[PDB]
Structures are given as C-alpha cells and as structure tokens.
C-alpha cells in the first residue's frame, strides 16, 4: 500500500543516512587543530547610510563592489553609494511591502521582492533618466523571499509556496519550477559558477539545485528549526546556512553532509543573514539579538562582535573584492563595517 | 570644498533625493495603516464593501479609502496561503488590526473536519494574533458581522453546541454579549492594548464611523506615549 512504498523510501533514507557516516572519518575540528587562530577581528563603522524611514529588509552589493541597493518597507528602494554617501536613485515601489532586493552582475537591473509575490524588475542605465519597471514577473502564489540574478536575463525567485522558480526577463514566463520542498523557501544563493544554487526552506532542509536541468541534486537536513539564511563558500564546494536554532551550519557539496556547527551557548536568538567573507575565513552572521557576529569558518570559535544596531540585523553582504560588510538593520540605518 | 565639479553636483542630487524621502515620510506617517485579518469566508469581503475609494497582486490587496481627511489603508491579507510566522513582522507598526469574525459561526462546523467549530477555530486564530510578540502596543478593532443572520439562528438552534458551559438565556441581547466577552478575555496583555468590539450589521453604514472612532483613540494613545503623558 502507501506505507509499503514509503518503507522503501525510509530504507533508502536509511541508505543515504548510512553513506554519509561511511565517509566522515574525521570532522572539521579534528583536522584543523594544527592551524593558527585568526585572532581578534575588530571592525569600525566606516560609513553609515541613513536615508529610509522604515525597516531595511535586504541589501545587495553591486558587482563593481561600490554601489549598493537596499530596500525598505516604506516603499522606497534606494541605491546607495558606499564610498561617499550619496543616494544615486530612490526608486518608489508600487507595493510598499518588500522582502528582498538584488543587484545585477552587470549592474543594469535591480529587482525588488515583495509580500505581494510579484518580483518587479527595474532598469537603471536607461534613456530618459527615469527608473522604470522593465517587467513584473507574476506567477508565484506565495510571497517572495530572495531573488538573486543569474545574469541580465535569468533571475531565480524563491517564493513562499515552496517554489524556487527561474524566470526569463525578455519573455515574462518561467523556464523551470524547482519543486520538492515542503516548507516555504526562505533564502537562496547562487554558486560562483552560477550552475548550481542552494535554497533554504522552512523545514530545516537545504537543497542544492542546478540551473540547467531543474532537479534537486542533494538534500541536506541537519538543522532543527527553519533555515532562515544561506550563502556559499567562495569556490562552490560548501555553503553555510543560518537557522532560527541560533546555529550556523557549514555543509559541503561533495561529501554530502554537515562539516561544522557554529554555536555558542550565550546566544539564543535567531539568524537572519549569513555571508562568507572573501577567502572563506570569516563567516559573518547577523543575529537578531541586535549583534553581528564574526565566526571563524575553519575553527568554531568567535571573533569580534560588530554590535552597534538598535534593532534587528536583517541582511548582510560582503563586497566581491572582500573589502566591506554592509549590514542592514531594522532601525533605518545601514552601517558599512570594514 | 575638496570635491570636483561633478561630485559637487552629485551631492546636490543626493540631497534633492533626500528631500523627496523626508517630504514623503511626512505623508505616509500621517495616514493610518490597518491590518485586516480574519477568515476568508468570515464576511471579510463585506466590510471592504462599505466604503471603497482607491488581478496580478494575488497576495495582498490594499484599499486606500478615506474618511474625514484621514487616508486609511486596509491590507487584506487573504491571499497568503503561507506561514504566518515569517511575514507577520512586516505588519508591526500598523495602527490597528481590524479583525473580523462571522458571528453565525457558532454552529457551523469547519469544512475539512466535522469538529473544531469555526468559533473555536477563530478564537485560536485571534489568540495567536492578539498575543503575538510583534503586536503588543497595537490595539485590535474587532468586528462581529452577520448579526442580521445570527439572531434568527439562535431562537431555532441552541448556542451551547459551541460553548460547553454557558448557562444563560437565548436572546440576542444576552447571548452575543457573552461571545463578545469571550473574546476579550483571550489577551494575556490587558492594558497595553484595548479591544474595540462592535456588532456591525451587513447593511448599515455606521461601522466606518466606528473604525474612525477607534483609530482616533489609538492615534491619541500613540501620541500620549510620544508627548510624555503616558
């Protein structure tokens, strides 16, 4: 019957849960004890960007590592400029509710998120000086969670009806619809070769997809509560997630399991954004106990807490040259640590 | 001032842009935002049909109606067939929560299971909202509609199918004031918010005056905390 098929699945679940133990001869803290500690990493608030009047929900650095979009729920999507604090564009949103944003790798488009599950794509480097809506990618039924760009023609919207999509922008349609999640997906991030991308759902599961075919390659279930944030190691062989179980867990992609947990017994509050620094040594994380921790990524210890916000810390991002780490809080200030 | 001739015009733009935010935050903080909860069949689409001034937006439809120089904004959260725990913190800082409960739901059962009556279901939905951690200082308007449908159902069908220990009469005057007092005992927080109930009909027009009478209370109570009195 139904269970007689499901008994094959659980026994096959008992196979892949066995095969990971067949390979974990020694874990990450057993192999990297003969290394130096990175020591204390204190960072100073080099700029601060004070333009909105609401809660900052997401940011995304441009790939020239200077410009910076940040989207707040008073219906404004300001493109900052991190060197000298100048608002390049203030883009008035159609819907006031915005749950993410993303900047293009070319630097031409920004894409607001939404609680009304319409990923609207804006166009900056245009004739006639405006910032106007290029296309609105209706087609989800949930809400929208995190929508990074592959290039100027392919955007991967996560959603709130457990469907990470893959749109085209010239035509308005989807191309694939990566289904297979149970809880709604909460954050995704692309690999540095943009051929795979992870997605962290709301059932303690992180699935590694692929952009071409459209099927899940691996499913990592190590967490306890919902995975709230996700980000890649800078070579596409690992990714570290963030949960509401206050643990950042660093998985990998070729040994299929969890390499390390990053937990301290004084923190209880959730995680909202994880982003590896360049070279993958400083795993940053923004908790919602108002802090912004800086973990070592090869030993489990901490480093300098980048406290300084008067509310939650709701998005991070390291620049693509690894210079600065902008955090976007729930008071209206961004703070570009360095 | 150690800036080039183009960079000096860059921070003229970044202050002209900064003007058109700060002269817009004093246009969105003046107006009143109203979350509109409640079940999708519970007469939620009737209260929006009282006054309306304003297909792809399947998730949230706003309603920008106005009354006596006060732009209101009802956010009908009905299209979200997702988890409330993730997106409800977008709606903190709302001015009031226009809840809604169909009053005829005392004997009508839930559709998926022939148990957990919709009154006991909406009570568990109300309690999770009214005791949420993002909603403490935000008062709850509470509409009870279908009281044109309710009062003829009680004289021909008893109330105590829903409530196990009532021990009362069966008039619309007595019995509905028990449901109204059944709800307002669900908040663990009692003086940090105040439930402004109302027995609205489906055919009158005083309810939009009532929702004006209830946000003029919470704007005052948002100002007493700001002026320093409270």
């Amino acid at each position, epitope marked *: 019957e139904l269970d007689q098929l499901r008994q094959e699945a659980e026994q096959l679940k008992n196979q892949i849960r066995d095969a990971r133990k067949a390979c974990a001869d020694a874990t990450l803290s057993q192999i990297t004890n003969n290394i130096d500690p990175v020591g204390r990493i204190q960072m100073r608030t080099r700029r601060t960007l004070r333009g909105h009047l609401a809660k900052i929900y997401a940011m995304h650095w441009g790939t020239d590592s200077r410009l910076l979009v940040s989207a707040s729920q008073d219906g404004k999507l300001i493109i900052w400029d991190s060197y000298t604090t100048n608002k390049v564009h203030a883009i008035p949103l159609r819907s006031s509710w915005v749950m993410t944003c993303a900047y293009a790798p070319s630097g031409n488009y920004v894409a607001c998120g939404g609680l009304d599950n319409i990923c609207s794509i804006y166009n900056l480097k245009t004739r006639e000086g405006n910032v106007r809506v290029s296309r609105e990618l209706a087609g989800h039924t949930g809400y929208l969670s995190c929508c990074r760009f592959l290039d100027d023609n392919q955007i991967v919207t996560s959603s709130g009806d457990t469907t990470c999509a893959l749109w085209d922008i010239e035509t308005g349609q989807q191309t694939t619809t990566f289904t297979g999640h149970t809880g709604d997906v909460m954050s995704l991030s692309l690999a540095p070769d943009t051929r795979l991308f992870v997605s962290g759902a709301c059932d303690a599961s992180a699935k590694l997809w692929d952009v071409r075919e459209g099927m899940c390659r691996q499913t990592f279930t190590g967490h306890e509560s919902d995975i709230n944030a996700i980000c890649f190691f800078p070579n596409g062989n690992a990714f570290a997630t963030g949960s509401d179980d206050a643990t950042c867990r660093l998985f990998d992609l070729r040994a299929d399991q969890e390499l390390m947990t990053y937990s301290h017994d004084n923190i209880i509050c959730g995680i909202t954004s994880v982003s590896f620094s360049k070279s993958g040594r400083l795993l940053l994380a923004g908790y919602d106990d108002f802090n912004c921790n800086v973990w070592d990524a090869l030993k489990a210890d901490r480093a300098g807490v980048l406290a300084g916000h008067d509310n939650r810390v709701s998005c991070l991002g390291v620049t693509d040259d690894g210079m600065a780490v902008a955090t976007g809080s729930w008071d209206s200030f961004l703070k570009i640590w360095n | 001032c150690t800036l*080039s001739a*183009e960079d000096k*015009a860059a921070v003229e733009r*970044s202050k*002209m842009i900064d003007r058109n935010l700060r002269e817009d935050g004093e246009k969105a903080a003046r107006e009143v935002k109203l979350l509109l909860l409640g079940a999708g069949e519970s007469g939620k689409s009737t209260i929006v049909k009282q006054m309306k001034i304003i297909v792809k937006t399947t998730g949230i439809v706003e309603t920008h109606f106005t009354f006596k120089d006060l732009h209101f904004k009802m956010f009908d959260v009905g299209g979200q067939r997702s988890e409330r725990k993730k997106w409800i913190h977008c709606f903190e800082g709302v001015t009031a929560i226009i809840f809604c409960v169909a009053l005829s739901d005392y004997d009508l059962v839930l559709a998926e299971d022939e148990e957990m009556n919709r009154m006991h279901e909406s009570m568990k939905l109300f309690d999770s909202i009214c005791n949420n951690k993002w909603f403490t200082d935000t008062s709850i308007i509470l509409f009870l509609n279908k009281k044109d449908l309710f009062e003829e159902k009680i004289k021909k069908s008893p109330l105590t199918i829903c409530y196990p220990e009532y021990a009362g009469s069966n008039t619309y005057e007595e019995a509905a004031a028990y449901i109204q007092c059944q709800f307002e005992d669900l908040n663990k927080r009692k003086d940090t918010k105040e439930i402004y109930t109302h027995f609205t009909c489906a055919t009158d027009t005083k309810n939009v005056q009532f929702v004006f009478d209830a946000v003029t209370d919470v704007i005052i109570k948002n100002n007493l905390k700001d002026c320093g009195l409270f």
Partner: single-chain antibody
Amino acid sequence: VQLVESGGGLVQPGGSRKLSCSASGFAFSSFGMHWVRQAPEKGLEWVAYISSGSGTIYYADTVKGRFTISRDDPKNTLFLQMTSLRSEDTAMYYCVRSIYYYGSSPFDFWGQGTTLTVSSSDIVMTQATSSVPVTPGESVSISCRSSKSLLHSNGNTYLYWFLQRPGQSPQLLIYRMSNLASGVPDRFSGSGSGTAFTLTISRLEAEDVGVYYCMQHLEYPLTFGAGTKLEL
C-alpha cells in the same frame, strides 16, 4: 527623446531675447541642463548651467550677470534670457542636458540648436592637431593636451570627448575617460595620462567625419578645445 528649442531671429545690440528650450521626451526635473554656444567660425564655449531643481547656477565669464537662466519644471521648458547682448554673442545656441551621479553620462543628448545674430584662472584645453585628412581604414589617434592635471583625487579624469557631424547637432563619444556613451560603436576608445590625452579610433567609417571636441569638466567654467576637423 528630443530637446527642440526656439528663439533668436535677429536682435539689435544692447537689446534682449528670450531663448526657449522645450525639452520633450523624458523626466525633466532630474536633469541639470546646460547651454553651450558655437560661434559660426569658432568652436564651442560654455555659456550657462542650471542644476537639478534650480538649486545651483553657475555662469561663464563672458556672459556673467547679463544672461539670466531659469527652469520651468511643470511646463517642461528651459529659459535663457540675455540682457544687453553684444556683437560677440552671435552664435548657434545648444540646449544640452546632463545628469550627475556615479557612473552617469553627462552631456549626453544635445538639442537641435537655434541661431541668434546681431547687427553692427580658467582651464584651457589645447588641441595641437587641426584638419587631418583621413581615409577609412586607418587607425587615427586624436590628441588633446590639457593645462591643469585633470585627474582628481578620486580616480576620475574629467575629460568628455565629443563629436559633431557637419550641419547636425553634436553628440557624446567618450565620457570621463575611456568609457563609451550609450549607442556609440566600439571603434572610439580613449586613453588618458592626466595632462595629455588621446582619442583613438580603431577603424573608421564615413560617418565619423566632423570635428572632435575635447571638453574638460574639472571646474566651472568648463572650457572646450578648438576641435580638430576630420576630412577626406
């Protein structure tokens, strides 16, 4: 997008004339407009400017005070009113636009241009080339040396190259340095050195005939150079 404009005719000296630039096609109020003239034998000289929202207005030396400029954001026009003009003010008058942020393209679109005729500290840009007759195919390089060190303390060298095909209105080629404008082919590529510059054309077709103005942008008054004619 267009900036058509009107005015001029033929004014007696010491008089006045309103110059109207009705800029139709874009969102006006984010474009700090300028005004650049071309005397019928000479090159370009900067004349006026007005910033976004009429906040900042600079002026040249030779029309300082006696030329007034104004913007009309709702009616979407642009006004230059000249008071007591001389005989040294007969020129074609261009109505150009420019938007100034990080990575913008200032001086991008140039208006049609109206005549105006009469009746009887600054940086200087030299262009040692003049009237180089060319053939299509040869990689030709156009020099423009400057006087100040145009490289600022933030990486930019504010040198906007240009082009004017004969008869028609001019257009941008190369903004700040070795960047290309929206819609020029990949043949124009520049290279700077701070005080001495070079605009290089890899291959050139017949449509790249005309003059090539180098224009600095380091501080107002922003002075054009006497451009070099290209011919056959």
